[PDB]
Design a protein around this ligand. Structure first.
Ligand SMILES: C[C@H](CCC(=O)NCCC[N+](C)(C)C[C@H](O)CS(=O)(=O)O)[C@H]1CC[C@H]2[C@@H]3[C@H](O)C[C@@H]4C[C@H](O)CC[C@]4(C)[C@H]3C[C@H](O)[C@]12C
Ligand SMILES: C[C@H](CCC(=O)NCCC[N+](C)(C)C[C@H](O)CS(=O)(=O)O)[C@H]1CC[C@H]2[C@@H]3[C@H](O)C[C@@H]4C[C@H](O)CC[C@]4(C)[C@H]3C[C@H](O)[C@]12C
Ligand SMILES: [Mg+2]
Ligand SMILES: [Zn+2]
Ligand SMILES: [Zn+2]
Ligand SMILES: [Zn+2]
Lengths: 1164, 72, 52
DNA sequence: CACAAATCCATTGACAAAAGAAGGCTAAAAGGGCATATCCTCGGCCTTTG
DNA sequence: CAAAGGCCGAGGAATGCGCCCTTTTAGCCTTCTTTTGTCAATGGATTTGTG
């Protein structure tokens, strides 16, 4: 409908073009009748009627009188939503400089006049006259004169002398200004001003002058003469209860302007002196300022309160502004929340919706059904039916709800799995029943959390929920393709108890005929669930071109192993269930089922796993007692020995043999060591038990202790919490991080006395205070990242580039901490992978390295594959599907369209929430280190590099820094470095060093790494560091996501050789533009311009957006809007955030086709 | 999550990082130095038997502890 | 309104707790409906940006 | 298939009411004139006082 | 020769703030003229009755 937004400076005439009438009186309503006034801010002539199709007084009260203007009040009879649309204007009696173009930092008026800000402010607030074209009389244009000086200069000069003060002075300075002429003089000086500050500011000014020329703006429009008036329904004066009214602050500021403007007209008509009229003009200036942007002058005028009034600039900016939480965060209909419960019988695709929420949300659908089937004559009769909640509204509910997903969403949507479409299953009660295997995605436990359900309304949104967000489509973490459907705690304890043998149970060494017979034997109670039997198992192995050959054999398994084999689908081997099956065993079981069989068998398998886990966990009868905390008997022996050691060390310290802090360290170490012995002793007591037996002799097997079974099945708990339960508690911290050296020699099976329970409170309160505040800013990294990587979208199928990073294993000194197959799975190869025979193309090229190719690669022991990276993609304004990879949220390759930048932001932010919130140093860690990493900050101690290649050489001695020069083997050596002798060198002056090499030691600033070595160098650096943190805590997140964030980082170019192109030299340009520019200029008979690639921290790169509707969201709205106005910018929308704001489809998801067809039209 | 389980993780990390810092400061395995690196004095036998690998006698050690107490 | 405030500020002190509008209309000369509407005249309504 | 009573259709007269349309009257809202001259704190600032 | 004190001024809460009188302006309130909706007559052109 518009396809683009334009912006400019508003002319006085255009401000009257909008207006429907000039507001003159300050009044608002009548105080008695409450009727709008004849010229007040709430008028009826200016801003339209108060009731629909009904003039103010009431002569014309028919909709048949539409559009006619009443005669007694002039109020045209229209709809009173027109009053929410019509502007008015205020005829300022004096020009008043628009505060944005004056008190903004560059001050477009100031840098456009080539005048200092204080000087304009002196002319403006009536300090000093200014020469405005003073003829030939030796007067200086824009030369300030003071009062006395203006008088005496006027002495001997009865001739014009043309000097003025006030806003009229600046208006006559701007109006007289010739913009192209100044561009010409500034080009002629830039010709011959070849010195840095002079020609620098020359060019920096000619840029704005040429821009003011192009944008159509006139320079003097920044001096308001007419002032527009926001319509009444955007600043209402509505009544509250009991004669009470509630207004906007905008009405106060508007009244202040109107009063002072009317008084100024009065003063001028009354011929008042200079002091009074000057002061009235200053007052009108400050009033208009406060109206536009209250607070830039100082101080923010306060209302009938202590707090400032809110203004227009405030009405847009700030989280209470329009952009923040009215342009994105909106309250939505057809929605509602409740308290979630388990509902463990559902399938992965459904959610128990209460009948009452379902009857409220689906109201219009139900009304339509009752009037379609004839059960309700009209919509009123259907309304009464479903209000009584009769007997057929329930059948209609079943029919309407039948295939109609509902979006379930929980409050911290860290990732896109905090929204999933489920099919509603109607239930009694008022709690939403949420599948158990979905809590991991939602981060939802059933101790009182709540969920919001929304209802898709369109067929297209029904198909987006079903096809896209349905819970049985999203089962792999989008950050890393491991399935997100891992069974959690009753399930894994069920599968562990059943799949866990003991030495002599009922029915040992029977040879069952198969899993059916083992189940029939167990359920009749003839055999126990863990009784090692020979069982005949038929497993089907797709060892073929997907042929599924069957093979039967005689395995040795427990009865539960075989009972559970009945649920496993065909393609899976039998060794998958033949072990104990803790937590990781189950996650890997689902994973291999997914890598063999796909998505439908995996969803079925997940449901069957949950069902059998819950069933055999209930049959487990796995309680928790007090006798289950087996305190080891050697605990007080170990504590006596440790107490003796601390007493001995204290005796030596008393004899001056050690210091104080030394002995503190010694005793802290003694207590940590004795705690380790107690924990080890208790776990070796707990983790095994004796039992008899076929032949009759005692035999040790793993313990069936319940606390241990829960810690060891991976179901819940771990040996540390087990240590606190039966072993000793240990040493406790303080909030400072110091360690209280009086340990907790007690456990929780015993008690703590008052002192130890006090001492533990220190660390407890510290941890809770941190977890309470981490919850506050839980999603700041995700938001920072989606600021910069938002507009990045997969827009192309293949770019064809042969660039690609060389993926290899990370060998962290010893072994590998991440193999090549893991780092390379899912990526598209960039070149042919040759066999170790060095003549056999193993994987040819553009081959999505799935698990087959990845196994082929690890098999030949090919350990350096060149893969295509998102950072080396030759695509413009996007990425292709080949340089990206596979999806990792769906097993397949990425689709053309997928908005991978937002996926990358959330895939780095959500997993980051599992990291420490405060940085800790060991290689630091925590989230703050990751944020600083992406901000690309300069480390204070940069290991200096070798900027040029050549023979090393030194120079002058200690001019602060020891000097060095590198001189090429055949080239010039104009680069020398002030190497600090503090920077203790690494290479002697007699070892010729290659370019891009270390000189000093220390942290490498990524800017220098990028400038010395390939972009691949900077990208490998960044991914290796940030993944260092993420592996430090144990969290897995792919490298694709860091790579796309980095490609958003280094997206600016700096031009060295401008070539035959049209780029200025020392200029930074969007690299995606300069690429196409040099490509085109080299297409024709020119040569391209060569640049130096840049790098910006995410908060710096996201501040450079091609649009301005988007950039006014996460930035200062005021600076962005002032700049866009003076630039005459137009936003051709082409973005995600802009199309969200303006209310159309985004170009990312299903909207990609809409935007493609629309671009077809706009190019036709 | 329960809001106390994450608190547990925070407290665990805090205490462990403190414990291991105060452990690394011990440097039990070491070299027999036999003489002070500050005053060259004879580090007495008992102090080298208690702390294998000392570098300061108790006087210079306590001195350094005062300064590193304040800072810098 | 200024006169109403003056007479009330005096009468509450001299009469005890507070002047009921019948008492003001008696002490004043008004007809006790005019006084009630004068009381009902709202005052300086509010900033709709007020916190909740 | 021929002749007189039964009944939808359109004007007349009379006219009750609804709608304005003015004229008059208050009360309400706006405007005008007024003629001795001029609090509490804090702190500089200077007169007086010793 | 300095010190106390008397004096003046530069800055803030607020227990702080018009009254009496003339003159227009709004609006309500009654009174009357006209457009409009209604009840009853009073034939007059199809509908039915008849043989
Ligand atoms: C509690 C936290 C998991 C929370 C999820 C885990 C994950 C990483 C662990 C630290 C690191 O390993 C580095 C260091 C290694 C030393 O050897 C022992 C101490 C350190 C400080 C460890 C303490 C703690 O164990 C950490 C914080
Ligand atoms: C909740 C809010 C506190 C904000 C912090 C306070 C501050 C001002 C209060 C209103 C005003 O008093 C006007 C009015 C007076 C009536 O007599 C009682 C109702 C009204 C609507 C009040 C309701 C409420 O109490 C308000 C909104
Ligand atoms: Mg909860
Ligand atoms: Zn009207
Ligand atoms: Zn590409
Ligand atoms: Zn010593």
């Amino acid at each position: 409908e518009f396809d683009a937004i334009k912006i400019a400076l508003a002319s006085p005439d255009m401000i009257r073009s909008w207006s429907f009438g000039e507001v003159k009186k300050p009044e608002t309503i009548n105080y008695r009748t409450f009727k709008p006034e004849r010229d007040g801010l709430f008028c009826a002539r200016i801003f339209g009627p108060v009731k629909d199709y009904e003039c103010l007084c009431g002569k014309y009260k028919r909709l048949k009188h539409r559009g006619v203007i009443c005669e007694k009040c002039g109020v045209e009879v229209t709809q009173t939503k027109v009053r929410r649309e019509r502007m008015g204007h205020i005829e300022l009696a004096s020009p008043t400089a628009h505060i944005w173009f004056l008190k903004s930092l560059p001050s477009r008026i100031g840098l456009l006049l080539d005048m200092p800000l204080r000087d304009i402010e002196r002319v403006l607030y009536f300090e000093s006259y200014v020469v405005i074209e003073g003829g030939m009389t030796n007067l200086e244009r824009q030369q300030i004169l003071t009062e006395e000086q203006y008088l005496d200069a006027l002495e001997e000069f009865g001739d014009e002398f043309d000097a003025k003060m006030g806003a009229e002075a600046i208006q006559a300075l701007l109006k007289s200004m010739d913009l192209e002429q100044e561009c010409e003089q500034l080009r002629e000086e830039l010709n011959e001003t070849n010195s840095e500050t002079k020609r620098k500011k020359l060019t920096k000014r000619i840029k704005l002058l040429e821009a003011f020329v192009q944008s159509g703006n006139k320079p003097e429009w920044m001096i308001l003469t007419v002032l527009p008036v926001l319509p009444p329904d955007l600043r209402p004066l509505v009544p509250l209860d009991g004669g009470r009214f509630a207004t906007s602050d905008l009405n106060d500021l508007y009244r202040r302007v109107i009063n002072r403007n009317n008084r100024l007209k009065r003063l001028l008509d009354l011929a008042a002196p200079d002091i009074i009229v000057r002061n009235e003009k200053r007052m009108l200036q400050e009033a208009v300022d406060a109206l536009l942007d209250n607070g830039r002058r100082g101080r923010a005028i306060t209302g009938s309160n202590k707090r400032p009034l809110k203004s227009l600039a405030d009405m847009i900016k700030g989280k209470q502004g329009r952009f923040r939480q009215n342009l994105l965060g909106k309250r939505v209909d057809y929605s509602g929340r409740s308290v979630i419960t388990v509902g463990p019988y559902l399938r992965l695709h459904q959610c128990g919706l209460p009948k009452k929420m379902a009857l409220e949300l689906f109201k219009p659908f139900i009304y339509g059904k009752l009037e379609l089937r004839g059960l309700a004559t009209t919509i009123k009769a259907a309304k009464k039916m479903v209000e009584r909640e009769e007997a057929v509204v329930w059948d209609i509910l079943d029919e309407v709800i039948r295939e109609h997903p509902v979006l379930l969403n929980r409050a911290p949507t860290l990732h896109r799995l905090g929204i999933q479409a489920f099919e509603p299953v109607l239930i009694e009660g008022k709690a939403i029943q949420l599948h158990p295997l979905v809590c991991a995605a939602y981060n939802a436990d059933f101790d009182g959390d709540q969920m919001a359900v929304h209802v898709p309304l369109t067929l297209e949104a029904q198909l987006e929920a079903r096809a896209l967000m349905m819970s049985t489509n999203n089962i792999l973490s989008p950050a890393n393709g491991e399935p997100i459907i891992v069974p959690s705690q009753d399930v894994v304890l069920g599968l562990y108890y059943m799949t866990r043998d003991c030495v002599n149970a009922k029915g040992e060494g029977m040879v069952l005929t198969g899993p059916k017979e083992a189940e029939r034997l167990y359920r009749s109670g003839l055999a126990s669930l863990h009784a090692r039997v020979k069982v005949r198992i038929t497993e089907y192995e797709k060892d073929a071109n997907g042929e599924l050959v069957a093979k039967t054999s005689l395995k040795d398994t427990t009865v539960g192993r075989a009972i559970l084999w009945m649920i496993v689908p065909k393609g899976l081997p039998y060794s998958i269930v033949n072990q104990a099956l803790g937590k990781k065993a189950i996650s890997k079981m689902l994973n291999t089922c997914y890598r063999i069989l796909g998505l439908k068998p995996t969803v079925i398998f997940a449901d069957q796993i949950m069902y059998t886990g819950f069933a055999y966990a209930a049959r487990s009868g796995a309680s928790v007692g007090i006798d289950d905390m087996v305190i080891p008997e050697k605990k007080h022996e170990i504590i006596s020995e440790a107490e003796a050691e601390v007493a001995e060390i204290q005796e030596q310290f008393q004899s001056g043999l050690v210091t104080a802090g030394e002995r503190y360290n010694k005793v802290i170490d003694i207590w940590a060591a004795a705690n380790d012995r107690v924990s080890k002793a208790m776990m070796d007591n707990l983790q095994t038990e004796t039992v008899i037996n076929r032949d009759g002799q005692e035999e040790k097997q793993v313990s069936f202790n319940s606390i241990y079974m829960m810690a060891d099945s991976g179901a819940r708990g771990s040996a540390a919490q087990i240590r606190q339960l039966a072993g000793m508690r240990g040493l406790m911290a303080k909030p400072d991080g110091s360690i209280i050296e009086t340990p907790i020699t007690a456990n929780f099976r015993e008690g703590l006395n008052v002192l130890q329970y006090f001492i533990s409170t220190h660390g407890a309160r510290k941890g809770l205070a941190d977890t309470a505040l981490k919850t506050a800013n839980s999603g700041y990294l995700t938001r920072r990242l989606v600021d910069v990587a938002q507009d990045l979208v997969v827009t192309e199928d293949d770019c064809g580039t042969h660039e690609g990073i060389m993926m290899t294993p990370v060998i962290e000194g010893g072994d590998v901490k991440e193999p090549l197959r893991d780092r390379v799975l899912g990526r598209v190869t960039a070149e042919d992978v040759l066999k170790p025979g060095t003549a056999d193309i193993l994987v040819p090229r553009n081959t999505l390295l799935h698990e087959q190719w990845c196994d082929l690669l690890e098999e030949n022991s090919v350990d350096a594959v060149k893969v295509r990276s998102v950072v080396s993609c030759d695509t413009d304004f996007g990425v292709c599907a080949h340089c990206y990879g596979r999806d990792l949220a769906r097993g397949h390759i990425i689709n053309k369209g997928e908005a991978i930048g937002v996926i990358a932001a959330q895939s780095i932010g959500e997993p980051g929430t599992q990291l420490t919130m405060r940085t800790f140093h060991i290689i630091t860690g925590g989230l703050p280190r990751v944020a600083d990493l992406f901000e690309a900050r300069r480390p204070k101690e940069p290991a200096i590099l070798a900027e040029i290649s050549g023979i090393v050489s030194f120079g002058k001695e200690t001019k602060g820094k020891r000097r060095l020069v590198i001189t090429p083997v055949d080239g010039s050596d104009p680069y020398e470095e002030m190497i600090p002798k503090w920077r203790q060198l690494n290479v002697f002056e007699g070892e010729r060093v290659e370019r891009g090499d270390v000189i000093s030691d220390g942290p490498e600033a990524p800017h220098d790494i990028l400038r010395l070595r390939g972009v691949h160098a900077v990208t490998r650096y960044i991914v290796n560091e940030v993944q260092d943190v993420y592996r430090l805590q144990g969290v897995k997140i792919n490298d694709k996501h860091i790579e796309v964030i980095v490609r958003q980082m280094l997206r600016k170019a700096t031009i060295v050789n401008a070539g035959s192109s049209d780029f200025l030299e020392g200029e930074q340009v969007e690299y995606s533009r300069v690429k196409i520019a040099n490509r085109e200029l080299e297409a024709n008979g020119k040569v391209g311009a060569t640049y130096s690639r840049d790098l910006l921290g995410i908060t710096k790169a996201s501040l450079a957006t091609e649009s301005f509707i988007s950039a006014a969201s996460f930035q200062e709205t005021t600076r962005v809007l002032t700049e866009a106005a003076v630039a005459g910018k137009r936003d051709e929308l082409r973005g995600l955030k802009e199309n969200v704001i303006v209310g159309r489809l985004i170009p990312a998801g299903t909207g990609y086709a809409y935007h493609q067809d629309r671009m077809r039209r706009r190019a036709a | 999550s329960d809001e106390a389980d994450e608190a547990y993780s925070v407290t665990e990390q805090l205490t462990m990082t403190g414990i291991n810092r105060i452990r690394q400061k011990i440097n039990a395995h070491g070299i027999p130095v036999y003489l002070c690196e500050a005053c060259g004095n004879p580090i007495p036998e008992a102090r080298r038997k208690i702390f294998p690998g000392v570098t300061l006698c108790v006087e210079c050690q306590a001195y350094q502890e005062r300064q590193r107490k304040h800072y810098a | 309104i200024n006169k109403l405030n003056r007479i009330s500020r005096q009468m509450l002190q001299e009469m005890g707790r507070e002047p009921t509008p019948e008492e003001l209309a008696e002490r004043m000369l008004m007809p006790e409906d005019k006084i009630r509407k004068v009381l009902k005249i709202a005052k300086e309504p509010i900033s709709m940006e007020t916190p909740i």
